[PDB]
Amino acid sequence: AQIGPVTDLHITNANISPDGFSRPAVLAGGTFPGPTIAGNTGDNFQITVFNDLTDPSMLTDTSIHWHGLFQKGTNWADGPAFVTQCPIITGQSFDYNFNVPGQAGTFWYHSHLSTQYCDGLRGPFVVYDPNDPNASLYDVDDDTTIITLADWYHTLAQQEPIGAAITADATLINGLGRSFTNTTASPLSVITVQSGKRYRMRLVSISCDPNYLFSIDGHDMTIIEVDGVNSQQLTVDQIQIFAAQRYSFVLNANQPVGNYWIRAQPNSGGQGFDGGINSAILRYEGATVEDPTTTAPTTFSNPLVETDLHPLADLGVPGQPFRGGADDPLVLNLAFANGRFSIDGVSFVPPTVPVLLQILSGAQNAQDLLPAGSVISLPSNSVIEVALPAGAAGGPHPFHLHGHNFAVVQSANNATPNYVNPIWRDTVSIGGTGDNVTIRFTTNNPGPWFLHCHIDWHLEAGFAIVFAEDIPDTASANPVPQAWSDLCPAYDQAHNI
Numbered sequence: 423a424q425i426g427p428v429t430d431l432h433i434t435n436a437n438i439s440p441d442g443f444s445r446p447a448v449l450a451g452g453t454f455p456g457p458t459i460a461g462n463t464g465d466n467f468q469i470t471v472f473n474d475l476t477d478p479s480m481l482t483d484t485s486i487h488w489h490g491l492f493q494k495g496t497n498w499a500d501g502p503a504f505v506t507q508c509p510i511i512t513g514q515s516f517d518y519n520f521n522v523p524g525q526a527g528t529f530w531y532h533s534h535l536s537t538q539y540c541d542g543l544r545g546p547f548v549v550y551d552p553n554d555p556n557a558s559l560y561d562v563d564d565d566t567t568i569i570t571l572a573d574w575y576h577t578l579a580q581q582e583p584i585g586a587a588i589t590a591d592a593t594l595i596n597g598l599g600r601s602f603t604n605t606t607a608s609p610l611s612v613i614t615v616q617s618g619k620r621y622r623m624r625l626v627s628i629s630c631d632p633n634y635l636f637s638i639d640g641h642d643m644t645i646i647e648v649d650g651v652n653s654q655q656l657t658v659d660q661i662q663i664f665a666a667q668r669y670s671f672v673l674n675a676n677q678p679v680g681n682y683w684i685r686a687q688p689n690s691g692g693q694g695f696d697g698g699i700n701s702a703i704l705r706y707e708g709a710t711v712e713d714p715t716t717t718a719p720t721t722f723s724n725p726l727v728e729t730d731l732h733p734l735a736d737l738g739v740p741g742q743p744f745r746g747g748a749d750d751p752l753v754l755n756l757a758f759a760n761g762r763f764s765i766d767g768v769s770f771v772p773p774t775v776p777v778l779l780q781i782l783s784g785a786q787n788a789q790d791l792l793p794a795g796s797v798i799s800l801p802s803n804s805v806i807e808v809a810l811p812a813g814a815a816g817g818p819h820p821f822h823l824h825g826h827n828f829a830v831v832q833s834a835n836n837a838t839p840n841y842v843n844p845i846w847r848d849t850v851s852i853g854g855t856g857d858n859v860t861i862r863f864t865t866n867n868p869g870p871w872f873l874h875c876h877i878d879w880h881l882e883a884g885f886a887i888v889f890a891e892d893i894p895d896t897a898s899a900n901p902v903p904q905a906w907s908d909l910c911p912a913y914d915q916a917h918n919i
């Protein structure tokens with residue numbers, strides 16, 4: 423069952439075996455993935471997070487981010503450790519109390535301390551729209567239509583050896599899948615449909631790293647939502663989904679009653695489907711309980727291409743229709759060397775005092791904010807353009823901006839910008855060498871907003887900056903509760919800082 427919008431959420435350690443290999447994990451709600459948090463557009467969420475963690479190998483502190491929610495006036499509840507809060511210490515709790523005006527769609531939540539979400543603290547977050555403009559396109563939209571894609575590691579995140587390549591051990595679809603090596607025939611997830619019905623499938627990448635080529639044998643998929651933004655209908659037969667992205671698609675259960683493979687091929691780790699890796703099962707009601715016998719095509723006829731997506735609403739693009747046609751045009755120099763990422767020559771290392779607290783304490787320009795060189799001020803009520811030219815090792819990098827969604831004026835693998843009707847989203851692949859993926863947004867949300875690669879291993883290696891949007895108005899716009907004010911002193915005491 424779905425929980426929320428007002429709920430407790432316990433964070434605990436437990437052993438799990440989603441691919442037949444047992445290891446300890448960091449879990450929300452006792453499960454991997456965590457339980458779906460849900461409500462309606464405009465609701466007040468009050469998620470009281472109880473930190474009950476005791477195993478230091480996966481960190482006993484935590485902080486939770488509500489990915490894609492704008493947090494306007496509630497920057498303190500956004501979750502990124504050392505940006506908007508100090509972590510919650512073990513044996514304590516914290517009420518993330520916020521509202522979701524003007525948003526409806528598919529989101530997710532995850533730890534935002536170190537690489538802890540990789541150890542299991544990840545789950546779906548759905549904001550339903552009682553007056554959804556896409557409602558007539560489908561018959562079913564509920565917990566049974568959520569599809570999560572996750573990477574899973576046998577080695578604990580904190581224990582990944584310095585200097586060795588990090589790859590996953592399994593792909594998990596709805597929490598189940600088979601290991602790439604020493605594959606055993608552990609249970610696969612089943613997604614059940616009834617012949618003739620239409621389903622709003624909510625596809626959520628909760629990945630720490632790989633992108634997936636997602637498809638369903640025999641079926642096609644009509645995209646209706648991108649990262650919370652309603653789209654015009656776009657029919658595709660494969661979706662390349664990057665870490666932290668979401669799509670909703672209509673699945674028409676219009677094939678013969680049977681079993682069909684659901685495929686999610688990561689860009690690293692096990693290649694193909696031998697032994698049922700990278701797989702789940704779409705089962706029609708009345709089908710035999712047995713594995714599918716279907717195959718994929720050699721070549722997909724209609725893969726998703728991002729420039730084919732367009733908003734359902736007339737969203738346009740802010741600013742003027744040319745490069746640099748913004749109030750604050752930025753071009754970030756994104757680089758990697760010697761194990762560390764950098765943005766404009768600075769590798770991100772989290773500060774001791776959270777950025778928001780530094781601002782509330784009176785730091786009022788970005789040159790006064792720590793970490794030095796990692797915080798960039800943005801002016802209020804302005805059009806911002808950010809160019810994110812690719813080339814840094816480890817790509818393609820899915821960049822994500824907190825506090826905002828943005829127009830994707832230029833997408834991967836295509837040198838032509840779109841100043842008319844590009845999709846808006848919150849996580850975008852910056853592509854490959856020579857690309858110039860570029861985003862635009864307007865600054866109407868005061869506070870410090872993280873911008874980073876959502877490959878969690880790259881964030882940990884410094885691939886981030888903070889946009890301190892409207893520093894002068896941050897304090898007035900974001901009143902803080904006493905419980906938030908108490909986080910830093912409690913954390914610093916517990917850690918002898």
Ligand SMILES: *[C@@H]1O[C@H](CO)[C@@H](O[C@@H]2O[C@H](CO)[C@@H](O)[C@H](O)[C@H]2NC(C)=O)[C@H](O)[C@H]1NC(C)=O
Nearest residue numbers: 745746747751752753809811812856857858860
């Ligand atoms: C990506 O686009 C940005 C503009 O959005 C380009 O930035 C220009 O860079 C040149 C030097 O390369 C400067 O002289 C300009 O001041 C920049 N701003 C402009 C033209 O608006 C950037 O070069 C592009 N990068 C790639 C790799 O194509």
Ligand SMILES: *[C@@H]1O[C@H](CO)[C@@H](O[C@@H]2O[C@H](CO)[C@@H](O)[C@H](O)[C@H]2NC(C)=O)[C@H](O)[C@H]1NC(C)=O
Nearest residue numbers: 727729730831835836837838839840841842844
């Ligand atoms: C590369 O991106 C451009 C810009 O988004 C795409 O160009 C648009 O193509 C559509 C469909 O033909 C036209 O309606 C638009 O007028 C084009 N816009 C512009 C600014 O050119 C283009 O299709 C993409 N290339 C590929 C191969 O998908």
Ligand SMILES: [Cl-]
Nearest residue numbers: 489490824825
């Ligand atoms: Cl966000």
Ligand SMILES: [Cu+2]
Nearest residue numbers: 487489532666
């Ligand atoms: Cu996220």
Ligand SMILES: [Cu+2]
Nearest residue numbers: 489490823824
């Ligand atoms: Cu986010």
Ligand SMILES: [Cu+2]
Nearest residue numbers: 819875877880
């Ligand atoms: Cu990256």
Ligand SMILES: [Cu+2]
Nearest residue numbers: 502824872874
């Ligand atoms: Cu983040």
